[PDB]
Design a protein around this ligand. Structure first.
Ligand code: BEF
Ligand code: BEF
Ligand code: MG
Ligand code: MG
Lengths: 117, 117
């Protein structure tokens, strides 16, 4: 299964794409908010995994836009521990909001959860 | 909008029923694991909130038993901070697994999510 993962920090970007790899997932990592929407239009993935603090455009705005043009699981994933952000993401159409401090095995388990609708 | 809440602790049982009540959902609280299913069968709720450490029958076995015979959303809410439990219950057909430590406006935000999804 195919996952576009919009993330600046190239270290976590490869580390996560590595882990998700061992467990049978095709991960196209994008490090610009400006470039996603395009990459996401090209790669045509079945789930989309957004960071928040991106360069250029940002995660949450990116989420709001993507909600119109396409109707599949969008999952946020950020260092920003904000109850307000969490509650607003879900209001705008995100399917989950996950702290980066979540154990990878649990991040995998939720991604699998969403790739069932 | 109706929810049965299997939960032994009388204190959390009230706070959740009062809070979710203020927000226009009808919460029925059953304090025994072995008695839920019967309470669920009758009350015919829209979503099921399970504690894990319950008398009679634990929330996790109770969850996989519902899967055969009820197809609404089941949300675990527990004090049990365990990666294995979380990952296991997503795979046994729960829709979410929430630490009781989660702020209540965030709990509401997620329940509202599943009462659409
Ligand atoms: F870059 Be993430 F939002 F931590
Ligand atoms: F009793 Be519960 F599982 F916190
Ligand atoms: Mg960032
Ligand atoms: Mg208990």
């Amino acid at each position: 299964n195919k996952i576009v993962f919009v993330e600046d920090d190239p270290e976590v970007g490869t580390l996560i794409a590595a882990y998700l790899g061992k467990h049978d997932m095709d991960v196209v990592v994008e490090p610009r908010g400006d470039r996603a929407e395009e990459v996401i239009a090209r790669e045509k993935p079945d789930l989309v995994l957004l960071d928040i603090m991106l360069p250029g455009k940002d995660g949450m705005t990116l989420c709001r836009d993507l909600r119109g043009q396409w109707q599949g699981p969008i999952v946020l994933l950020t260092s920003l521990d904000s109850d307000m952000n969490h509650i607003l993401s879900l209001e705008m159409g995100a399917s989950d909001y996950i702290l980066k401090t979540t154990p990878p095995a649990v991040l995998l388990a939720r991604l699998r959860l969403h790739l069932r609708q």
